[PDB]
């Protein structure tokens, strides 16, 4: 046992280890997306910048979870990061839609984790997810929904003018 | 009676009290409009900013009227602010059209008030409405008519590209 | 349903809509109070400034709640803002006492809302009320209790010297 | 009763009063430790600086708890601060080990207090302990565990070179 | 024996250890006083600030005595800090009166200590109490007597206006 | 085929895709290493900082390779990032030794890739590996060999003083 461990269930430690894997996978998906819009046949530079910064943020999220593990006396066990479930992302609209789907998946995993903490009487873990994850996620979900709405309104995916214009004004 | 009251008819005091209620209602309508364009299914950020600043201005208008009441020795009596007559505002064009309709309603109430002052020999009240309200209103009406014209020209409400583009260049 | 809605009960959405109405009413009460102390027969300038800034803060509180509604995929439904339950507020002490009463009413509505979130497993809403409302309210209640205590000590409401002196040193 | 009291159980008030006593005792223990390493026969200047700043922090923690008591309408009742349970602290390693033991004791008292708040439906108190105490404590526990690990690795307590070197590089 | 001990009687060492306990108790009394005037039913903010800074000063006095002990080769032995002899301090005037009483108690303990040094031929200890304690105490006693005089003159404790006014102009 | 593809063999494209996977794996190994030295039972803060920055660099290396793929008209295909082959890294010396082993593995993969380019007449790819990878790798290998030499000289892994001292002076 760790000399610093206090009120840290094995279930929580394990759930944290799984959260790290999911955040790392999310970063990989966004790195796939960013470079999709770097192709000469896509060329949406701002779409690429968006998913690159999202990828970096997800990595920061994983590194914060790993730090918490170490601070709670839990032991970080790492697993394989699976390949993004897609390689060709089609339009910018489909990529935003995929991103929303993945963010709502993380938020749920995070909510399930907050429930575990609430069920194991882990007030510190609760505050941590509330303080550093929950609202961030609600904020990403809303940004993506709005991106998706505007893209659909401007006529994307069929209007390439829209995706290009969306790139210059919003993502730009 | 107030020790500072001089040439202030009861009719004017009452008309001022009613003007305050209308300005407060106008602020509420614009607050409804601003948050309509904050929805994930609308996402017109600049439309939201426009109606938010309009809401703030209408509140300033009410507070100036309340100050005048106190300065003229009139007693401010407040009434219930009714709920904006709409909750779903549809397109950005419909919201601008509603805003014009409400501004022309305030200007008329203001003109009727200027008539009361002119009929009660209240030169101070007259200058006040002339100095702080009338032209402001003519200026809002013209800005809204132009917004409405450009939106209709660009193809709004049916062209979402137009509303989005209108948001980025004019409201933006 | 909203594309961004996740773990957001109808009860919570409705409770948020009601919280917005109460915050808007609180702003109206403080606007009534501010202009009460702008009368020539009252003339407590700092009392007026206090309740004006409180009014503005309550409006900011409502606008933050409306933003949260939009971010959680809830739909903002607005209701009529009732007239402040008083028009003549008597002394500065009575106004502070009314303000305390209304703040403890909001805090309770907020606490009841935090309970609903805790009962619907809404950790995000919980943090939101904890992060942006609860302590703020405890802080307002304490400022008002202290204002009320000092006013009663200095001899207010019967000592006009006290209310005037309280205005210059504390509110001033 | 206090005019500002709302949702504040007697149990919580009492638990807060006891938390204040423990934080004050912790400050006394750290003041004993700081001056232990100021002796001519010890002379670990940085060890002294560490426990002095820790002592000051614990005092700030008590003063924040006393402020919360006053803000919640609870009445601060103070008890005797017991003498630190030790006078000679031996090596720097033993002092760090004592400090860890005492920090894990405070964190537990804090966790028990968070449970009381969670059991009395005190969301404000909950956030307060989460916001200002819990993570701070997890952070102190981890800093001390690491200090203890490095000291044991470098060969302390038997190697005076280690304690001296630890003083110059880490505490220094 | 300490390698640095020279002309340091056991009586002096013990008297220094007792002086430390009294200074620590004085700090506790002032911390009780400071938070008394932070209550919603008292609300004398400047009275609170006064006794808080006094509390901090008394702690500095104890820490200087502990440093001297270490420098003279004496060994610091710590005892329990008793609870302030009061919990409710009534008026600001009574608190000042209590503070004077406690300061004259410390000065006497300090004078008795200076006598011990003069009787044991400890010129260094003599200068230390003369240099860092005696005049400071005479200066605190005079500030408190003057505070007490002005409070009694302005009509305190019965005039709450006085205590409030005293807070804004002198303590303020 | 891509409209920008010219002198880009399928073998090279595939070798680039494999290089990306290896660089991503290297980043994962360094992230495992960094957090190993963040444990309370390890606590080598500078060792953690070293492997964290190395992890970031390897990610930059992968992202540069992905950019080159897009610029040469090759299509990025991503595969699963395997879990670092170790979870407990033992001493700081073993971690450096592992890092050397992995860097010499990447350099070889890079050299094999430079051979493929030289064999397919791809002068651009050749310069790219020469310009951005080869020397960097020779420079990392030498830094790690030197780190390993100094650690072994100072007595690590058995001397914890050495690892701690190595952390403060070199990594520090
Ligand atoms: Fe994330
Ligand atoms: Fe207006
Ligand atoms: Fe509010
Ligand atoms: Fe503490
Ligand atoms: Fe003193
Ligand atoms: Fe690399």
């Amino acid at each position: 046992t760790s000399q610093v461990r206090q009120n840290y269930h094995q279930d929580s430690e394990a759930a944290i280890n799984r959260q790290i894997n999911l955040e790392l996978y999310a970063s990989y998906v966004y790195l796939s997306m960013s470079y999709y819009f770097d192709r000469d046949d896509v060329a949406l530079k701002n779409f690429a910048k968006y998913f690159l910064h999202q990828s970096h943020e997800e990595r920061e999220h994983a590194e914060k979870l790993m730090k918490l593990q170490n601070q709670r006396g839990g032991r970080i066990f790492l697993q394989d990061i699976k390949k993004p479930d897609c390689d060709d992302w089609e339009s910018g609209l489909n990529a935003m839609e995929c991103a929303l789907h993945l963010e709502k998946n993380v938020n749920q995993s995070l909510l399930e984790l907050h429930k575990l903490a609430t069920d194991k009487n882990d007030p510190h873990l609760c505050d941590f997810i509330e303080t550093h994850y929950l609202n961030e996620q609600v904020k990403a979900i809303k940004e993506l929904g709005d991106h998706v709405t505007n893209l659909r309104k401007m006529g994307a995916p069929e209007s390439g003018l829209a995706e290009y214009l969306f790139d210059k004004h919003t993502l730009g």
Side-chain angles (χ1 to χ4, degrees), chain A residues 84-101:
Chain A
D85 218 345
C86 323
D87 311 78
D88 196 280
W89 305 94
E90 304 179 15
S91 63
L93 178 63
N94 293 125
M96 288 298 184
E97 289 183 6
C98 254
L100 193 59
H101 164 87

Side-chain angles (χ1 to χ4, degrees), chain A residues 2 15 27-28 36 39 44 49 60 67-68 78 94 128 136 155 159 163 170:
Chain A
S2 180
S27 184
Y28 209 15
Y36 180 79
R39 299 167 48 173
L44 282 168
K49 197 285 165 192
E60 298 168 19
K67 162 181 169 57
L68 174 282
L78 291 175
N94 293 125
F128 183 89
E136 220 68 38
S159 171
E163 297 241 333
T170 295

Side-chain angles (χ1 to χ4, degrees), chain A residues 93 97 100 145-157:
Chain A
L93 178 63
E97 289 183 6
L100 193 59
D146 293 25
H147 287 336
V148 170
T149 285
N150 284 354
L151 278 164
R152 296 173 180 180
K153 284 169 164 296
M154 307 160 65

Side-chain angles (χ1 to χ4, degrees), chain A residues 97-116:
Chain A
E97 289 183 6
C98 254
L100 193 59
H101 164 87
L102 166 78
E103 297 283 33
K104 296 191 78 183
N105 284 7
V106 171
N107 184 37
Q108 183 51 39
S109 187
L110 284 171
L111 302 162
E112 298 161 6
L113 180 50
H114 185 275
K115 183 177 295 181
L116 183 68

Side-chain angles (χ1 to χ4, degrees), chain A residues 32 36 68 71 74 81 95 98 100 105 127 130 142 153 165:
Chain A
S32 171
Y36 180 79
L68 174 282
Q71 292 172 296
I81 305 171
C98 254
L100 193 59
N105 284 7
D127 202 35
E130 294 176 330
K142 178 64 159 44
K153 284 169 164 296
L165 289 177

Side-chain angles (χ1 to χ4, degrees), chain A residues 43-56:
Chain A
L44 282 168
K45 282 186 178 184
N46 295 326
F47 279 83
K49 197 285 165 192
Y50 183 83
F51 300 124
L52 196 59
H53 165 83
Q54 300 309 311
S55 170
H56 291 148

